[PDB]
Amino acid sequence: TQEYLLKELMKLLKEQIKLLKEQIKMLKELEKQ
Amino acid sequence: TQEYLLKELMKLLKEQIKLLKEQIKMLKELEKQ
Amino acid sequence: TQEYLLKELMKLLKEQIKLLKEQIKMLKELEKQ
Amino acid sequence: TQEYLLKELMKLLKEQIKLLKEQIKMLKELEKQ
Amino acid sequence: TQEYLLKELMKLLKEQIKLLKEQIKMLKELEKQ
């Protein structure tokens, strides 16, 4: 059961990475202004 | 109490994801002007 | 305004710091087990 | 070891807090402009 | 100045992503145990 929960935590951290990359793309749009 | 502690980390990581999505909404508004 | 949206981003980052501190406390308890 | 991995995770979260504090500082500098 | 600050925010988010990748490495070894 502990191993199953550790796999869930890794999935949630990967989602944080995806959203941070979306923020970087938005910061580049702002940099053109 | 390891399963309890891992479930509490799951909830905190989900809350982090929610905050990142709220930040993206604000960056989009900033880009519009 | 620009000022309004930057201040809201600051509040959301401060909330992320609060949650990271709670995550550290959960890891500290796991380490003892 | 389990102890090594949990102690290193705690150190990485503390480094994340330091980055968030610097992100807040950059937003405050943007606000002044 | 505004462009310099936006580029610094991009660098800080890239540093966050690197820390999150390192956290995933540690959770991966804990899951194998």
Author numbering:
A (entry chain E), B (entry chain A), C (entry chain B), D (entry chain C), E (entry chain D): 1 to 33
From the paper:
CCs are quaternary structures comprising two or more α-helices supercoiled around each other with cyclic (Cn) or dihedral (Dn) symmetry. Here, we describe variants with all combinations of the aliphatic residues, Ile, Leu and Val, at a and d to give four classes of peptide: the ββ class, with a and d = Ile or Val; Lβ, a = Leu and d = Ile or Val; βL, a = Ile or Val and d = Leu; and LL, a = d = Leu. Peptides are named systematically appending the one-letter code for the amino acids at the a and d sites to “CC-Type2-“; e.g., CC-Hept becomes CC-Type2-LI. In summary, solution-phase data and X-ray crystal structures demonstrate conclusively that different classes of Type-2 coiled-coil (CC) peptides—i.e., based on abcdefg repeats with predominantly hydrophobic residues at a, d, e and g—adopt a range of distinct states.
Finally, we tested the importance of β-branched residues at d in maintaining open-barrels outside of our designs. A recent design of a parallel pentameric α-helical barrel 5H2L_2.125 has a single Ile residue at d. We mutated this to Leu to give 5H2L_2.1-I9L. The peptide formed a stable 4-helix assembly in solution but crystallised as a mixed parallel/antiparallel CC pentamer, which is another low-symmetry structure. Thus, the single β-branched residues at d appears critical for specifying the open, all-parallel, α-helical barrel of 5H2L_2.125. In addition to a/d combinations, residues larger than Ala at the e and g sites influence the state adopted as they strongly specify against high-order blunt-ended barrels and fully collapsed states. This is demonstrated with the 5H2L_2.1-I9L mutant that lacks β-branched residues at the a and d positions. The sequence crystallises as an antiparallel pentameric barrel instead of forming a collapsed structure.
